[PDB]
Amino acid sequence: SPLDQFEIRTLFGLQSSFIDLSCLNLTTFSLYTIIVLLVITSLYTLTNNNNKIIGSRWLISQEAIYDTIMNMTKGQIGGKNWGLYFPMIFTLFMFIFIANLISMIPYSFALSAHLVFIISLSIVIWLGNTILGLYKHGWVFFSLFVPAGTPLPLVPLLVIIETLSYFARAISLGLRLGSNILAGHLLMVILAGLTFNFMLINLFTLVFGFVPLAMILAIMMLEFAIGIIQGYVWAILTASYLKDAVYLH
């Protein structure tokens, strides 16, 4: 069982017999959400030395993240009011960016590799695009489903397999991230499990047994890239989707 690293264990506990209060209780998932919140709080509270203008070396990091997500959501929705949807496009980044660096620490735990939470967050953003689009643009919201000047005898086909791609968008956006984080962690644990039993046979294998160690180091080098790039790709697709929902093509 190489997948035991994702087990959810209850720690602080709470129960009753009147009402099902077992929904909220401090758990491994919940404790790592508390840790994510305290890290994100720590990146801005004690980072700023006594509210100085000059912005010490720690604040350049949270300066660059801010600027690379402003200049990304200005180039996507880019209309009359792009900044009204900027806090959500930033707080969808920082959760995924911090929750995929915390998960790299060896005896730790991936928030992002729970499909039930990430798929739920994706369905929340998809319904919050459809409701916002219907509210802002009435019955002509469905004009999104015809591409451009197209010949009329093939328009209903191009409507059906446009709407099918419109509600595949509900689960695709989440399952991309879930699949990347889950496959990366499962790859690292399985190769560690193979190189461990590689190094317990006869003593000639601990000699020149440095090359599988170097391969695992190279995969860990790759895994930060595949963890930060997904945190960026989430925040670019849910900027493009707000471009479609707010502005009709």
Partner: peptide, 24 residues
């Protein structure tokens, strides 16, 4: 901005196909 049978130019046509496949 289509023109079906020289009638009034239809709105976007997208709702009617969904309504046809809805009742099935």
């Amino acid at each position: 901005y289509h023109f079906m049978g020289k009638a009034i130019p239809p709105h976007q046509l997208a709702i009617g196909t969904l309504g046809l496949l809805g009742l099935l």
